[PDB]
Symmetry: C2
Subunit: 70 residues, 2 copies
């Protein structure tokens, strides 16, 4: 029972106004309802387009890190 509920802090609507309000709010709600897991596609990632010095620490902290983050 530990979830955030909608609160009507002020006002005492009757069942009809409550129903209208909830219907409108549900209609307003949207966006990604139950989206699939976002597909990984590292092809042509910006990090791969950079010039790295042969001894650059960013070869570890930026390039390898980006390729390995999962």
């Amino acid at each position: 029972d530990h979830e955030a509920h909608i609160k009507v802090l002020r006002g005492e609507p009757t069942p009809e106004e409550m129903a209208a309000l909830m219907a409108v709010l549900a209609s307003a709600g949207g966006g990604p309802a139950e989206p699939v897991k976002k597909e990984r596609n590292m092809w042509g990632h910006p990090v791969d387009k950079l010039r790295y010095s042969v001894f650059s620490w960013q070869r570890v902290t930026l390039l390898e890190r980006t390729h390995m983050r999962r």
Copy 2:
């Protein structure tokens, strides 16, 4: 004087014979014998043709080191 010289361990040549021997040896000398003129050219070096895992330790111990040795 700490130069390594030629030694005639056995035998006792006369000056003419020593002259002949030394002339033949000097002619047989190895010429330039690998001069210091060698120049660095890392274009198309084999290490750059290898597939490296994104986290390969050989990126440090083989690739980076080969590119950095002087």
